[PDB]
Design a protein around this ligand. Structure first.
Ligand SMILES: [Mg+2]
Ligand SMILES: [Mg+2]
Ligand SMILES: [Mg+2]
Ligand SMILES: [Mg+2]
Ligand SMILES: [Mg+2]
Ligand SMILES: [Mg+2]
Ligand SMILES: [Mg+2]
Ligand SMILES: [Mg+2]
Ligand SMILES: [Mg+2]
Ligand SMILES: [Mg+2]
Ligand SMILES: [Mg+2]
Ligand SMILES: [Mg+2]
Ligand SMILES: [Mg+2]
Ligand SMILES: [Mg+2]
Lengths: 251, 251, 251, 251
């Protein structure tokens, strides 16, 4: 282990589910982590459940909040030193077709899922470039960045945008020798206590016509691909999509 | 010909370049067309250059204008009867990396390229479903929906979003037997009088490392794939990307 | 119409189903056509059902037969003049998983589906380059070139190979200014009298979890995309995949 | 570390370059490894350079040799116990366009790159299914499985075939609860002593129009993604492509 020796990571939406598993494995591999979320009570308990404040801290933030992004990078620097690693994991879903999406639902989802990923990616490049950090921006971009779902219109838009915007950033950073890589992670269906709050959702998600493995994944499935992408093991990977989906997109 | 017999089409940004070539070939194939653009002087001249008002008319519209979308469908209905066909062609570009994109540039581009395509797609589904029209929504989604360009960050975001949002819409329309197809068209570099306004742009675009054919395309190259997608010839095509790029994405 | 004015086309497996529909629409659009198949009785009747020998003829050929490819181009030249257009449509399927595929089944399928497409593409480039024909090689490359099917192991291999081999050919022809385009067509499930010979196959193929439109296509669905790709309308399209699948790959 | 605790791996072409780096990192992570290659002198020295015979051994094999595949699995079992992990890395290249590829060159390359990967994948499924091994088949499938190169016609065919054949295998194994995953790894250009034998090749490969990072990768870049895919860390990944290419395919 020590696969993230000396790394300093921000993980948005790091207080629950997938983001918390990423935070946990990051700390286990020697990273210092700042997790974000909307609720201090959840966030402080989550940080304490992983490690001590010299390993992991919480910062209250809505990823749609442009000015808060600046305060989050400042706070992480103050705690841990220069940020090397950003996981843009925070996101929301609307369970509507394109046809049935209100303009308010459209703008709310895109504010988090697209604007927030843009704000973090843009600031991350500026803060992490040319510092010799082996810097890595890891953007959460979904199986819904590859295929449509008739009931996730706005979500599909946001995840298609993250997929290709990330390639633009990867290229610019590579061509300018910034020592910043940008890649996307594309989870299939994962058992999150949220999924456990939607009766029948896991069974629907586990049908062979959806997930050929016949079950959904766990948060650590996404944590381990994020460790690889944060570490210098992946120093030649940039501009690429990393899919962990139980076969969903293979059929 | 008569490949678009009885079709009624809206083409956004139809007053110039690619949109005007689509309008021209649509009228030649028997469609009735409403073209949109921002400037009445350009739009009325463009409509008259193609045909008489019983074939083609102009409607002044900014595709980012949600309320104007409703007036545009109403006007087209009043002129020509129920709309069967929508080409979401209007778009803008910012020549910035993700890193160098201002929030104002980001929001301006996404308002046209993403929100406008959403507004048109959403309204088109509601207006064209269940009428036996052989309805077709054709969304302009770029080579920049497949690959990054380090100087087109916001554009890449918008075109990745259009690519996958369109698949969501296609699926919902198919599963609900709406008789609406949704597909994307992905131009490579095309000689538009705008390109002719950027000295050196066509030569840059024609380098074999960019366009393997060693030259860029013309507006009619995009018009002909749009005729196919508007016609009942393509009644089994939905949720797919149609690329006309001189080999750009093949290498 | 006259969309294929002056074109001279070879269509392998042109005596039945999809290949015959391509032949029919090619002749309707002004092409001269040589169809191939294994059985003279079927082939001569098929040619006569479409038109007179000044429009369409039959040549008996197994697409796996390298030497016969040379005789087929010679025969087509003798009938109609220089060949401008090749549709590599002939193919076979084995209904086996990778695990359950015999080496004999593997080699038999690849001989037709991969070697035959290679032989035709390679000879087509040599015969059609630098003649000002607006030459077009159209290779049949399947939805099974994009996604796996657990019961089509060898077929998936062959169609993935055709997909990317075609891009190599497209690039070389473009870079060398050969005036030859190479593209792939990717049918979803199509009602062929063969499908009509497999009880339950069409219903299985029409389930929304397979084809979101809830029905399969017809041979003319593939004929019309092939007309576009054969015609000079598609003179800027090369190295690309054209999918006509009822939404199969969109989910 | 111990990320491959208890795993037993076969790595074809494991005596040199990328395959040797995969072998090295596999042994470092606790796997037992059988490397293959054509030359015993190279292979025995390679095994000894990594570890003792209780960690790593060599088996002389041409991956095109169907019967030798059976002897290789038997030998690995005898040395180390049941095989859990197969890396189909052996491959050759022909530096020819499709047009200029001889039939002999075509068949020679496909025998190694396609038939050999098929033989190994097919036998691996049969030997590793239903044993609770957390089994993983990792097939080498190239950037040339995603994009064409005008001078790699047969190579492009083989790597497109491996890409999609692997998805078929992944699906069948998932649906049948075999406890076998199948994934592809897609290197960009990597500095191998072979590349060092082609004067000017690395510089050509490092041009920003080819590899946006402006340099090529090293063998360990491919070793680390293979460790991830062999380990139980990737137990929810199957049917997917893992690209490590310095940005080559992102533009
Ligand atoms: Mg919280
Ligand atoms: Mg807050
Ligand atoms: Mg699918
Ligand atoms: Mg105007
Ligand atoms: Mg206006
Ligand atoms: Mg917005
Ligand atoms: Mg595609
Ligand atoms: Mg490229
Ligand atoms: Mg026949
Ligand atoms: Mg015969
Ligand atoms: Mg050797
Ligand atoms: Mg040998
Ligand atoms: Mg063979
Ligand atoms: Mg991909």
């Amino acid at each position: 282990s020590n696969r993230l020796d000396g790394k300093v990571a921000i993980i948005t939406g790091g207080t629950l589910g997938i983001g918390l598993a990423i935070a946990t494995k990051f700390v286990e591999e020697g990273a210092k982590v700042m997790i974000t979320g909307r609720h201090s009570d959840v966030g402080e308990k989550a940080a304490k459940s992983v490690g001590t404040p010299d390993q992991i801290q919480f910062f209250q933030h809505d990823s749609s909040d442009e000015d808060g992004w600046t305060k989050l990078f400042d706070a992480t620097e103050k705690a841990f030193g220069p940020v090397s690693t950003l996981v843009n994991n925070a996101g929301i879903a609307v369970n509507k077709s394109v046809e049935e999406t209100t303009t308010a639902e459209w703008r709310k989802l895109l504010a988090v899922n697209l604007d927030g990923v843009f704000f973090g990616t843009r600031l991350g490049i500026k803060r992490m470039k040319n510092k010799g950090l082996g810097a890595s921006i890891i953007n959460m971009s979904s199986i819904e960045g590859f295929v449509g779902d008739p009931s996730l219109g706005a979500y599909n838009a946001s995840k298609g945008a993250v997929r290709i915007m990330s390639k633009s950033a990867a290229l610019d950073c590579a061509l300018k020798d910034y020592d910043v890589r940008v890649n996307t992670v594309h989870p299939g269906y994962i058992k999150t206590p949220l999924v456990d709050d939607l009766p029948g959702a896991e069974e629907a998600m586990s049908q062979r016509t959806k997930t050929p493995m016949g079950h959904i994944g766990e948060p650590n499935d996404i944590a381990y691909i994020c460790v690889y992408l944060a570490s210098n093991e992946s120093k030649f990977a940039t501009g690429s999509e990393f899919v962990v989906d139980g076969g969903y997109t293979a059929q």
